[PDB]
């Protein structure tokens, strides 16, 4: 009974440290980085700052963690449920692949992956930040190759703005929970370096809306 009490103090200290760590980690935004192969996700990671990679950074007194699982190459259906509760899902897609083929168009594969992730039973209330990279290449390629290669239903002049807006709508139309979740789109810009600002603003809006939802101010 003499030494049996020190275990109680050890347990109390362990619980205090656990509570402190939980309070420290609860105020850290969590982002899941996804995207089909041969995308601009590496560029995003570089702009921010062998199975899974973690990138921690800070912006305007707000800490963010980004988890990349590109080196898994396994059945996603088994481990996708591990990222439940993350603050957002950053989905990267390159437009330049609208005509490239890996057979099949990589754009259709990216759209299938987006439909599988967004409409997943685990991610029913998480927000998605869509990064349509390779804006310059897609703007300079449409001048010769039309968008009809992938989207034959498209009808419009071969211009950057029209085709980009059409692709944005096509990617946003795959969402089914139009009211539970919202999708934030941003065409990546390298010169301005505002991607982190966009992510910060999106996360802030998400948090504010959740708070309003929680205190009866729907």
């Amino acid at each position: 009974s003499a030494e049996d009490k020190a275990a109680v103090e050890r347990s109390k200290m362990i619980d205090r440290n656990l509570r402190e760590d939980g309070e420290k980690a609860a105020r850290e935004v969590k982002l899941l980085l996804l995207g089909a192969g041969e995308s601009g996700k590496s560029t995003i990671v570089k702009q921010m700052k062998t199975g899974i990679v973690e990138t921690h950074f800070t912006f305007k007194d707000l800490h963010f963690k980004m988890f990349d699982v590109g080196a898994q190459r396994s059945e996603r259906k088994k481990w996708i449920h591990c990222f439940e509760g993350v603050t957002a899902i950053i989905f990267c897609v390159a437009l330049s692949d609208y005509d490239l083929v890996l057979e099949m168009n990589r754009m259709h594969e990216s759209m299938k992956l987006f439909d599988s992730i967004c409409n997943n039973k685990w991610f029913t209330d998480t927000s998605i930040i869509l990064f349509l990279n390779k804006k310059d290449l897609f703007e300079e390629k449409i001048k010769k190759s039309p968008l009809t290669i992938c989207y034959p239903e498209y009808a419009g002049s071969n211009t950057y703005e029209e085709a980009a807006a059409y692709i944005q709508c096509q990617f946003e139309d795959l969402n089914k929970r139009k009211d539970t979740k919202e999708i934030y789109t941003h065409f990546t810009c390298a010169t301005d370096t505002k991607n982190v600002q966009f992510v910060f603003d999106a996360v802030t809006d998400v948090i504010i809306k959740n708070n309003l939802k929680d205190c009866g101010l729907f």
Binding site: I14, L18, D21, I52, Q72, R73, S74, K78, C82
Partner: protein, 339 residues
């Protein structure tokens, strides 16, 4: 030409194996066990509850002493508890918050864990300083580590989603042996009492019995209609049980090379995450995604109780070597001891 004749030979040999399994099947388990009397309802109440985890619990394991246990949570914590006094003995912070398995060495000196990091982290508890330290970090797998069990104090068997398993020597750090043959992500494994053989289950709806020394596969067992999430070994060492996502458990035999009993119910459609046997092998405790665990009579396939004390998916289930308790851990961040 070669591919066609090889395919035909494989098909004919599989048919021959089927005919052999059929010929050796003269009766069924239930028919021989109809004379024995049931054991009745098994009522087990929560005797202790463990709190402290701030996120989902993904795995646990009991020690040889049947008193200390371990549990990993997505919060980046691996907690070692004392079941008797529900006192948090150890709390190790992981460099990666993605962990999906735990292992307590039989000697109790080392512990292991792994997950999406694809590394098996061996921690030495009995260090001179008194503060746990990462003893080793086994790498080489090309997928997530699903299960790991300490075969000894220096060797360890691990399974990954790369469709292979690996026996490692902790000291050297290199794969002592590699086991291939599976066509899907291996999700669970179980060691035999003698440690000379071990069975592994994958998402290909098939299990395989591998030998350690020779490094070859002895037998392959089928029958499931979906992935295999858990698997346990019978104490006698001559049979095992497998749990899948199709809401069904199945008992396979080694010598007979055929299934014996199927534990399933029409009212259950949820998946299975963990299964365990009693010290006598009469009972079979299986955790489901219906927020509860079910106790089946191995020799009769009749439910003998229901453990309903969790508000979320039951992720892990374990039984001690003594057989005087059962531990259950769920995504609700709570562990519960029964009887």
């Amino acid at each position: 030409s070669e591919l066609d004749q090889l395919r035909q030979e494989a098909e004919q040999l599989k048919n021959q194996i089927r005919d052999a399994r059929k010929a050796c099947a003269d009766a069924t388990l239930s028919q021989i066990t109809n004379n024995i009397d049931p054991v009745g309802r098994i009522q087990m109440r929560t005797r202790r509850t463990l709190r402290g985890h701030l996120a989902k619990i993904y795995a646990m394991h009991w020690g040889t002493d049947s008193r200390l246990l371990v549990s990993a949570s997505q919060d980046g914590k691996l907690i070692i508890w004392d079941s008797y006094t529900t006192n948090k003995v150890h709390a190790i912070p992981l460099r990666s918050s993605w962990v999906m398995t735990c292992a307590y060495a039989p000697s109790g000196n080392y512990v292991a864990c792994g997950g999406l990091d694809n590394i098996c982290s061996i921690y030495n508890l009995k260090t001179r300083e008194g503060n746990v330290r990462v003893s080793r970090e086994l790498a080489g797998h090309t997928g997530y580590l699903s299960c790991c069990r300490f075969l000894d104090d220096n060797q360890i068997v691990t399974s990954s989603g790369d469709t292979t398993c690996a026996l490692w020597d902790i000291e050297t750090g290199q794969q002592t042996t590699t086991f291939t043959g599976h066509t899907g992500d291996v999700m669970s494994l179980s060691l035999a009492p003698d440690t000379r053989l071990f069975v592994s289950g994958a998402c290909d709806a098939s299990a395989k019995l591998w030998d350690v020394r020779e490094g070859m596969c002895r037998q392959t067992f089928t029958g499931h209609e979906s992935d295999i999430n858990a698997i346990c070994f019978f104490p006698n060492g001559n049979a095992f049980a497998t749990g899948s996502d199709d809401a069904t458990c199945r008992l396979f035999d080694l010598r007979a090379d055929q299934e014996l009993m199927t534990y399933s119910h029409d009212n259950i459609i949820c998946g299975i995450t963990s299964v365990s046997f009693s010290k006598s092998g009469r009972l079979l405790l299986a955790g489901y995604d219906d927020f509860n665990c079910n106790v089946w009579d191995a020799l009769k396939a009749d439910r003998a109780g229901v453990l309903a004390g969790h508000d979320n998916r039951v992720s892990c289930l374990g039984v001690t070597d003594d057989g005087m308790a059962v531990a259950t851990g769920s995504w609700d961040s709570f562990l519960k001891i029964w009887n």
